[PDB]
Amino acid sequence: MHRIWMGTDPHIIMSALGSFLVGAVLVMHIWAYGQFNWPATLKAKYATP
Amino acid sequence: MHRIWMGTDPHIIMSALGSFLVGAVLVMHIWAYGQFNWPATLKAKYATP
Amino acid sequence: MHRIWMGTDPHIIMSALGSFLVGAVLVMHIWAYGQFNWPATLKAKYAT
Amino acid sequence: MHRIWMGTDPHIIMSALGSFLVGAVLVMHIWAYGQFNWPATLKAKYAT
Amino acid sequence: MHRIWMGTDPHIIMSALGSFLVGAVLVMHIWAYGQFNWPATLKAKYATP
Amino acid sequence: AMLSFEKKYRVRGGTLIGGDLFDFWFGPFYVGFFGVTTIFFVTLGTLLCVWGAAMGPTWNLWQINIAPPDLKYGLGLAPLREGGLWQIITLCALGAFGSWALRQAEIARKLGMGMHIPWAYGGAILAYTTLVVIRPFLLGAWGHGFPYGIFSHLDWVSNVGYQYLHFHYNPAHMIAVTFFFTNCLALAMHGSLILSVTNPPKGTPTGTSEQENVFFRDLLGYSIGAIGIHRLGLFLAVGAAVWSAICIVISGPFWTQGWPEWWNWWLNLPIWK
Amino acid sequence: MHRIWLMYDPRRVMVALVGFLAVLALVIHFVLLSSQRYSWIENGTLGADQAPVGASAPAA
Amino acid sequence: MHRIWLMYDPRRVMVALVGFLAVLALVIHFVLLSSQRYSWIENGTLGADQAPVGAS
Amino acid sequence: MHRIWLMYDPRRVMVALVGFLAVLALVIHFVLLSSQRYSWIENGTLGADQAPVGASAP
Amino acid sequence: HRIWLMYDPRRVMVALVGFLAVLALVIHFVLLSSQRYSWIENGTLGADQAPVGAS
Amino acid sequence: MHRIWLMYDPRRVMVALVGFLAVLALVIHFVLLSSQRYSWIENGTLGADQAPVGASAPAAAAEMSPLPPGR
Amino acid sequence: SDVKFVPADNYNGSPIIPTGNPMIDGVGPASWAEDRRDEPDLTYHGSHKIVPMRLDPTFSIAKGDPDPRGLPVIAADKQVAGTVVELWVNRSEPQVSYYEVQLASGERRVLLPTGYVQWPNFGLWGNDKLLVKSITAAQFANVPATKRDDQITLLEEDKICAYYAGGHMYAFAE
Amino acid sequence: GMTEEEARRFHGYMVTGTLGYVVVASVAHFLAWSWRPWF
Amino acid sequence: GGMTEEEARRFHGYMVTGTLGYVVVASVAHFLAWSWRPWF
Amino acid sequence: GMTEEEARRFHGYMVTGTLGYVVVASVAHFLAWSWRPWF
Amino acid sequence: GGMTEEEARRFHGYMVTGTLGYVVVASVAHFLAWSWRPWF
Amino acid sequence: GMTEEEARRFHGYMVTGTLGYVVVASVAHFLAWSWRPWF
Amino acid sequence: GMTEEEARRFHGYMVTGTLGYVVVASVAHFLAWSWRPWF
Amino acid sequence: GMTEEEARRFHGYMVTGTLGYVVVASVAHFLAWSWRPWF
Amino acid sequence: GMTEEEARRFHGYMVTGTLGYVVVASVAHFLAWSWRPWF
Amino acid sequence: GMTEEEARRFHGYMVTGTLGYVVVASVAHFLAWSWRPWF
Amino acid sequence: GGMTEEEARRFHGYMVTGTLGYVVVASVAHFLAWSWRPWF
Ligand SMILES: CCCCCCCCCCCCCC(=O)OC[C@H](COP(=O)(O)OCC(O)COP(=O)(O)OC[C@@H](COC(=O)CCCCCCCCCCCCC)OC(=O)CCCCCCCCCCCCC)OC(=O)CCCCCCCCCCCCC
Ligand code: BCL
Ligand code: BCL
Ligand SMILES: COC(C)(C)C/C=C/C(C)=C/C=C/C(C=O)=C/C=C/C(C)=C/C=C/C=C(C)/C=C/C=C(\C)CC/C=C(C)/C=C/C=C(\C)C(=O)O
Ligand SMILES: COC(C)(C)C/C=C/C(C)=C/C=C/C(C=O)=C/C=C/C(C)=C/C=C/C=C(C)/C=C/C=C(\C)CC/C=C(C)/C=C/C=C(\C)C(=O)O
Ligand SMILES: COC(C)(C)C/C=C/C(C)=C/C=C/C(C=O)=C/C=C/C(C)=C/C=C/C=C(C)/C=C/C=C(\C)CC/C=C(C)/C=C/C=C(\C)C(=O)O
Ligand SMILES: COC(C)(C)C/C=C/C(C)=C/C=C/C(C=O)=C/C=C/C(C)=C/C=C/C=C(C)/C=C/C=C(\C)CC/C=C(C)/C=C/C=C(\C)C(=O)O
Ligand SMILES: COC(C)(C)C/C=C/C(C)=C/C=C/C(C=O)=C/C=C/C(C)=C/C=C/C=C(C)/C=C/C=C(\C)CC/C=C(C)/C=C/C=C(\C)C(=O)O
Ligand SMILES: COC(C)(C)C/C=C/C(C)=C/C=C/C(C=O)=C/C=C/C(C)=C/C=C/C=C(C)/C=C/C=C(\C)CC/C=C(C)/C=C/C=C(\C)C(=O)O
Ligand SMILES: COC(C)(C)C/C=C/C(C)=C/C=C/C(C=O)=C/C=C/C(C)=C/C=C/C=C(C)/C=C/C=C(\C)CC/C=C(C)/C=C/C=C(\C)C(=O)O
Ligand SMILES: CCCCCCCCCCCCO[C@@H]1O[C@H](CO)[C@@H](O[C@H]2O[C@H](CO)[C@@H](O)[C@H](O)[C@H]2O)[C@H](O)[C@H]1O
Ligand SMILES: CCCCCCCCCCCCO[C@@H]1O[C@H](CO)[C@@H](O[C@H]2O[C@H](CO)[C@@H](O)[C@H](O)[C@H]2O)[C@H](O)[C@H]1O
Ligand SMILES: CCCCCCCCCCCCO[C@@H]1O[C@H](CO)[C@@H](O[C@H]2O[C@H](CO)[C@@H](O)[C@H](O)[C@H]2O)[C@H](O)[C@H]1O
């Protein structure tokens, strides 16, 4: 399966993978913060009355 | 059946298949989120009363 | 894993990483100041 | 760690560090004056 | 540590240090005159009623 | 198809941007990179004009009217049906007119010509840009541009003139008109002289430079010379457009009263105040 | 079918095609954005039961 | 797919692409900036339920 | 990445870039100065809760 | 910096000086046209008396 | 710093310099002369407390408007 | 080859590519009207219109202006190409049509149309050399020759002007 | 022009550049969506 | 350029290791998130 | 033209200048956001 | 061109040492922050 | 024309002049701030 | 110019690129129709 | 482009990846069906 | 361009100055904390 | 051309003339401020 | 051009001397200022 890499520069690969992971992780967090009501409960815990 | 791959470059094959799957999966999830009322039931579980 | 650094310039790496850390840390602090209500409670302590 | 400095110029490095420190210090003071209510308490102490 | 001055011109150093010192001193006085209420108390001491 | 002497001249080179990639012809037309951008802007702008006609009250050619937005929108892009469509077409027009001038520069460079034609056309682009960009920007709203419609823009010209009560009194307008009228006389004069030496009455030898020089000197009292009349024509025609640009940009941004009362400075010169 | 590329230079058919599609795509978006029903920037969040529908005047 | 760079000299395509994207990005921003729903310079702090909607 | 500078004369690109950034910066400052909320020369001393906000939904 | 080997200092100096002059004049005339900073007419007002835009 | 004159022709610099200073002097004088507070030919004899000052704000009656109603 | 150029490819609108030296062959902006009549232009009285100024003592420099004769000519590569020996004047509309240059290297005299020349400060001051922005000093050696040196045909006028017109595109070409 | 080998080398950067741009835009859109959805 | 089959073979080993390490860390994160606020 | 080694060192300064500017701009946005946030 | 395998080897050990140091300092920051204001 | 030694010495006074100008501007801003703050 | 072989090779990319683009547009219309049908 | 031998290897992996993907998807649907049946 | 033996001497002072600066700042924070503690 | 011999003497005149002018202008502002101050 | 190490070594000694002198004077200034109007 490793033969897939033979055409490839390793920095091109690490750049593509690194870009994808940053995109996915940020989308997943922005989405999750909307669904789970967190940090909204965190902000409510310490908000001034 | 393998002979269909002759005269093709495997990286454009995988780039095309990869782009198709990313498209299909996102279409299907966003459609499914409309029909199944999830994550909307998740949000309602934790939303502030 | 050290072989990943071949063909790079150390200073370009340290420039990129240094700039990422500055950007990330500023984002994190502005966000955290909002969520944790600090320095707002600090300001309220000494305000007049 | 020293060989990171190879191929750099000390007068560039000290200019970059010096400009960062000046900026960071000034930013930190104008920020701190806002939170700590100082010199505002000093001004009020001697205000007529 | 004197080697930091290597290849520099002392007229440039004294111009840079001198201009910096004038700037810092003037700013510090303009600021201090606002906070300490001086010369405002000096003026009030001799002003005509 | 090609002129019987043309093929010799169709070499590569003289382009500004595209290198050899667009350096080709399509029928008579030279393309080049700014040919491509020209046709893009021409096609987009024209189809948006046709869309503005379609959503308007009529297809009558004279009556079509794509108007700018209300002044309340300031320098923002209005809703498209409320005049934002006029703003998109205006960007397309600027893209087309600029591309046309740069394409002309590539053609002149390929033929070994001077850049006189692109720069002369720049005088027309300046006047257009003054009407739809510079004067509206100085007044603070894109809504000061003229509407795109064969007669509706004449209603705009009419009403802008009467915003200053008596626009004939605009001093830069008087100069611009004088250039336009003098240009047309000069064109009639030069056109007639060349034709009348090259087409003498039947049974007469073809005329000469000396004859047109003699006749022209009888007309004006001085001899202008062959290069001089073309310098004069270029000066008059382009000067007309430049003074036109001045006369409209001073109306509103700089002067806001009636134009007749601008002349109050002349009546108050101290030698006769 | 491929002999079309012997008649025309592919390097400039492809430029003409990309340009045509760019013009057409922009035209259709500006047309829709001019409409009321498909003014999606201002009203895209309306559900289809709330979306505008144009009618003629009642012929009373 | 790389052969597109043999047809089109890439040094030129990058400059045309960058230009096209720059103009396109600006046009989209100016469209949004002067809409009612997305005039974020004036109303960006409004919550999603407070933001305008272009109902007829 | 550096072979981009084999494609383009850096002495041209730096002029083109500085020109672009100068125009972009000037446009963004003008857009803000033309706004109500960020017309900072007239209203910059207002607190964040005092500064203008555009209209809500009805 | 070696940057002066790329760009003629004899040109950059004039271009810089011309840029700074244009920017400086623009900012002064912008301020002079404002209400709050029309200093020739209202410069003697105190900061609490000077104009402020609407809340 | 004198090497600046090896770069720039001294004879020409003087003409450029005087020209700049003459324009700037005239611009500042005419700006001041056009102002109210410093229209010194008409009002130069006023004391500093009597010279005009710009308003802390303009004022109006609620039904008055400087501009006609429009759209 | 006798053909001066060939198509770049077989498609309809394609450019032509010169086979030989385009400045000498006359291709693109270096080309001339090859059918043009090989006779002198004439005045209304039938004398030759363009002639060297020594051939008509009616003509002189305006007393304020420098006579260019004797000055060095500087080609596009900043070499000296030669010195101005003579001026050729138009006798129908009095002006200098051509400078005549004795080449610095070699022995030939060649014509140089005005309007390709310019003065270092456009005439305002320092008029001590002439600039020829369009061609290099080696290319001056191949400037087309008039078949007599007191008279120039309309064809020769076209050939000479075309040689300098090609220079901006081709003077530095490989 | 460039060789086919140079074309394959350049095309690799062009993909990662495009991908990085699309990634940043995708985050930018989901931030905008989270703030003020357009459907 | 590119990678030889030997280079690809060991590059793959690091890629597999990094992918598995990343998924392991994500697995712990999900176990914690589920224990904190389960979503089904 | 450019030598490759000259291009490599220029690229280092160019990247460092670009990211330096972005860092200064990011601090300017932190200050502006603290003064008057836009979301 | 660019770093050799020799340079990469020792550079990596420093790069790893720096990153580990950062994670340690940030760990203390979170331990103190959690002691001050817990967020779950 | 230019040389590295001319570039070095020119850069010296150019940096000095820039600092001097930025010092004067900083004092002018802090005088203006003390007279009529803009935030 | 180009041979029939080069033409036939280009034609394969051109046909597949066209059909790929038409597939992407088909899905965009499916999404648009589900959001707000035009008939 | 790939030879018949290269195609043979590529096909073996392409088939295996497809089967693995379908297997995972089958588990996903079985879980989704157990959670919220859609017929 | 700084060489390896110069870099040792530069680094030695650079570390020493950094530590001195941090120590001074640490006293400054200790004083500030004793004056107005912020947690 | 310009010599170092000319340049150093010329710089003396320029600097002295500039400073003299600025001194005269300083007195003019002293007078103007005494008559009608602008802050 | 610019300072040789012997020149720099003289220059440094005077620079340190001037900096110390300045800081000493400023120290007296602050002691006086504090006794006149304490600011904490
Ligand atoms: C005709 C019988 C009835 C008569 C009574 C009514 C009409 C009276 C006028 C008749 C004029 C001649 C019409 C004609 O057939 O021309 C053929 C010829 C083309 O050149 P050619 O030398 O003759 O032929 C060579 C060609 O056949 C073979 O070479 P090749 O194969 O490479 O050529 C490609 C061809 C393809 O042919 C065409 O496409 C013909 C296109 C004709 C378009 C006319 C449009 C008119 C309506 C526009 C409405 C508006 C649409 C937006 O040739 C070309 O590529 C075409 C080159 C010409 C491009 C013309 C561009 C527009 C000209 C101005 C348009 C009017 C602006 C007001 O094209 C031209 O010369 C057109 C331009 C000449 C007229 C300009 C007049 C401008 C007057 C402006 C003052 C108006 C004051 C109110
Ligand atoms: C590098 C040579 C090939 C390539 C080879 C592979 C390999 C090898 C794998 C995938 C797999 C995937 N590829 Mg692919 N793929 C390429 C180009 C792309 C592009 C693109 C627009 O360039 C896209 C969108 C995709 C899409 C996808 C997904 C459907 C899938 C999940 C991994 C991922 O992160 O995907 C999104 C990817 C991107 C947005 C950009 C490309 C990122 C880099 C180049 C590839 C990451 C692979 C990753 C390290 C695999 C980890 C698994 C372990 C090795 C066991 N590929 C290039 C041309 N692809 C994986 C899969 O389906 O496994 C069952 C997989 O193992
Ligand atoms: C000189 C070659 C490298 C370089 C080498 C180093 C080294 C070595 C270190 C850092 C460190 C840091 N660098 Mg770095 N760094 C470079 C370029 C940058 C750029 C940029 C825009 O290009 C940025 C934003 C940063 C940012 C950063 C921070 C994350 C961090 C220290 C704070 C800081 O910002 O100081 C302001 C900095 C700048 C505005 C630019 C760089 C100026 C000089 C080089 C910074 C020296 C910091 C300090 C004195 C070093 C102390 C060493 C220890 C005593 C052993 N660096 C250049 C290209 N950088 C330190 C770190 O990792 O701390 C956790 C560290 O030890
Ligand atoms: C109002 O609403 C309206 C507007 C109306 C609605 C409608 C909108 C419409 C219709 C939109 C259409 C959008 C569109 C359609 O295609 C949009 C398409 C966008 C695209 C394609 C974006 C692509 C971006 C790619 C980038 C940025 C690449 C960067 C590459 C980099 C950085 C690397 C460069 C290479 C290097 C460094 C290596 C050198 C090595 C060398 C030389 C060597 O090694 O040799
Ligand atoms: C919310 O609604 C919606 C969004 C709809 C919900 C749905 C979301 C969906 C569908 C998500 C899908 C996610 C997904 C699917 O695949 C996600 C896939 C994720 C993947 C693949 C993660 C892989 C990570 C791998 C890493 C980190 C590797 C690191 C490698 C390292 C450290 C090694 C470095 C050293 C090397 C290389 C050696 C060089 C040596 C050399 C050169 C030598 O020695 O020569
Ligand atoms: C709030 O909501 C949202 C935002 C959604 C929340 C989510 C946030 C998320 C997802 C955050 C993710 C963060 C993250 C990762 O994932 C963050 C990653 C952080 C990392 C990796 C930090 C690494 C730091 C490394 C440092 C400091 C190293 C310094 C090295 C030094 C000083 C040594 C220098 C000397 C050398 C090298 C030797 C040269 C030798 C030479 C030249 C020779 O030998 O020749
Ligand atoms: C308001 O409503 C109004 C608007 C009025 C309503 C009306 C609308 C109307 C009338 C619409 C009409 C639409 C239309 C009509 O036909 C639309 C037709 C559209 C078409 C055909 C689109 C075609 C797209 C094709 C594409 C994208 C091809 C891409 C190809 C690629 C990527 C490969 C390039 C080649 C390579 C890589 C090989 C190099 C190798 C080489 C050289 C080698 O190996 O040698
Ligand atoms: C309020 O909300 C927000 C803002 C969000 C809050 C958060 C803020 C945050 C996150 C702040 C982070 C700050 C930070 C992060 O690292 C700060 C880092 C600061 C640093 C590194 C300081 C370092 C100072 C070092 C100094 C002074 C050294 C001077 C050395 C000298 C004088 C000697 C030089 C000798 C030489 C040159 C001799 C050469 C000889 C040679 C060559 C020979 O002999 O050859
Ligand atoms: C409405 O209000 C708005 C406008 C809005 C507000 C804003 C205003 C703004 C932005 C203003 C900016 C002002 C400005 C900024 O720098 C102004 C800068 C002014 C300057 C630099 C003045 C310099 C003057 C220098 C002089 C006079 C020199 C004289 C030299 C003499 C006499 C010597 C002659 C000797 C000779 C010749 C002998 C040579 C040797 C010989 C012959 C030999 O040796 O042989
Ligand atoms: C209010 O709110 C805010 C503003 C926010 C509050 C915060 C404020 C802050 C952060 C302030 C920080 C200030 C600061 C920080 O460092 C201030 C630093 C000040 C310093 C460095 C002062 C140094 C002075 C040095 C002097 C005077 C030296 C004189 C030297 C002399 C006389 C000798 C010259 C050399 C000779 C003679 C040898 C020639 C030999 C030659 C040529 C040969 O031998 O060849
Ligand atoms: C990328 C380089 C760095 C660029 C820097 C600029 C980034 C822009 C800001 C991004 C993060 C914003 O983060 C957000 O800050 C706002 C500021 O009102 C906080 O807002 C909240 O807290 C603050 C402070 O207590 C209150 O005044 C405010 O009324 C309340 O809404 C949010 O709780 C926080 O989530
Ligand atoms: C770019 C300098 C000007 C703007 C600076 C903005 C703030 C950031 C300052 C960071 C410190 C300077 O960091 C700068 O980094 C570059 C590359 O990263 C270093 O390295 C660069 O130059 C050296 C010396 O010619 C080359 O050997 C090297 O290959 C090249 O990348 C410089 O020697 C250093 O001066
Ligand atoms: C760039 C083209 C568009 C790609 C768009 C992505 C979605 C479409 C799926 C692409 C899948 C691969 O698509 C297929 O690629 C191969 C090469 O790999 C092309 O093959 C083409 O070139 C090869 C040689 O390279 C010739 O032998 C063949 O006759 C010719 O058709 C096919 O014409 C195309 O159908």
TrEMBL record, chain F:
Keyword Nucleotide-binding attributed: no
Compartments in which it is found: Endomembrane system
Protein name in the entry: Reaction center protein L chain
Gene3D superfamilies registered for this protein in UniProt: Photosystem II protein D1-like (1.20.85.10)
Membrane topology: Multi-pass membrane protein
Binding-site residues for Fe(3+), renumbered to this chain: H190, H230
GO CC terms: endomembrane system; plasma membrane light-harvesting complex
Positions of bacteriopheophytin a binding: W100, Q104
GO BP: photosynthetic electron transport in photosystem II
Predominant subcellular localization, coarse grouping: membrane
Superkingdom of origin organism: Bacteria
Name of a matching Pfam family: Photo_RC
UniProt KW keywords: Bacteriochlorophyll, Chlorophyll, Chromophore, Electron transport, Iron, Magnesium, Membrane, Metal-binding, Photosynthesis, Reaction center, Transmembrane, Transmembrane helix, Transport
Source organism per UniProt: Gemmatimonas phototrophica
Bilayer-crossing regions: 29-54, 114-138, 172-195, 232-255
Binding positions for bacteriochlorophyll a 2 per the UniProt entry: H168, H173, C247
Role, per record: The reaction center is a membrane-bound complex that mediates the initial photochemical event in the electron transfer process of photosynthesis.
Protein family according to the UniProt entry: Belongs to the reaction center PufL/M/PsbA/D family.
Chain segments annotated as coiled-coil in the UniProt record: none
Binding site for bacteriochlorophyll a 1: H153
GO MF, one example: metal ion binding
Keyword Isomerase assigned: no
TrEMBL record, chain G:
Keywords: Antenna complex, Bacteriochlorophyll, Cell membrane, Chlorophyll, Chromophore, Light-harvesting polypeptide, Magnesium, Membrane, Metal-binding, Transmembrane, Transmembrane helix
GO BP term, example: photosynthesis, light reaction
Protein's membrane topology: Single-pass type II membrane protein
Subcellular localization, as worded in the UniProt entry: Cell membrane
GO molecular function: bacteriochlorophyll binding; metal ion binding
Residues that coordinate or bind bacteriochlorophyll a 2: H29, W40
Ranges that cross the membrane: 12-32
A GO term from the CC aspect: plasma membrane light-harvesting complex
Keyword Methyltransferase annotated: no
Domain of life, per lineage: Bacteria
Residue ranges constituting the Antenna complex alpha/beta subunit domain according to the UniProt record: 1-41
Predominant location category: membrane
List of residues binding bacteriochlorophyll a 1: H29, W40
Sites bearing N-formylmethionine, chain numbering: M1
Function recorded in the entry: Antenna complexes are light-harvesting systems, which transfer the excitation energy to the reaction centers.
Name this polypeptide is given: Antenna complex alpha/beta subunit domain-containing protein
Organism: Gemmatimonas phototrophica
Whole-protein residues included: 1 to 60 of 71
From TrEMBL, chain J:
Main location class: membrane
Annotated GO CC locations: organelle inner membrane; plasma membrane; plasma membrane light-harvesting complex
Positions bound to bacteriochlorophyll a 1: H28, W39
GO biological process, any: photosynthesis, light reaction
Domain (Antenna complex alpha/beta subunit): residue spans on this chain: 1-40
Domain of life: Bacteria
Annotated TM spans: 11-31
Assigned keywords, A-Z: Antenna complex, Bacteriochlorophyll, Cell membrane, Chlorophyll, Chromophore, Light-harvesting polypeptide, Magnesium, Membrane, Metal-binding, Transmembrane, Transmembrane helix
Subcellular location: Cell membrane
Record's keyword annotation contains Magnesium: yes
GO MF entry, a single one: bacteriochlorophyll binding
Positions with a binding annotation for bacteriochlorophyll a 2: H28, W39
Membrane-related topology note: Single-pass type II membrane protein
Described function: Antenna complexes are light-harvesting systems, which transfer the excitation energy to the reaction centers.
The protein's name in its UniProt record: Antenna complex alpha/beta subunit domain-containing protein
Source organism per UniProt: Gemmatimonas phototrophica
Lineage: Bacteria, Pseudomonadati, Gemmatimonadota, Gemmatimonadia, Gemmatimonadales
UniProtKB/TrEMBL annotation, chains N, P, V:
Residue numbers binding bacteriochlorophyll a: Y22, H30, W39
Topological category with respect to the lipid bilayer: Single-pass type II membrane protein
GO CC field: plasma membrane; plasma membrane light-harvesting complex
Record-listed a bacteriochlorophyll binding positions: H12, H30
UniProt domain Antenna complex alpha/beta subunit: residue ranges: 6-40
GO molecular function, one term: bacteriochlorophyll binding
Gene Ontology terms: biological process: photosynthesis, light reaction
UniProt-listed InterPro entries: Antenna_a/b, Antenna_beta_CS, Antenna_beta_dom_sf, LHB-1/5, Light-harvesting_complex
Positions of transmembrane segments: 16-36
Cell compartments where the protein resides: Cell inner membrane
Recorded coiled-coil stretches: none
Keywords: Antenna complex, Bacteriochlorophyll, Cell membrane, Chlorophyll, Chromophore, Light-harvesting polypeptide, Magnesium, Membrane, Metal-binding, Transmembrane, Transmembrane helix
One Pfam family per UniProt: LHC
Keyword Ribonucleoprotein attributed: no
Job of this protein: Antenna complexes are light-harvesting systems, which transfer the excitation energy to the reaction centers.
Family: Belongs to the antenna complex beta subunit family.
Protein's UniProt name: Light-harvesting protein B:885 subunit beta
Source organism of this protein record: Gemmatimonas phototrophica
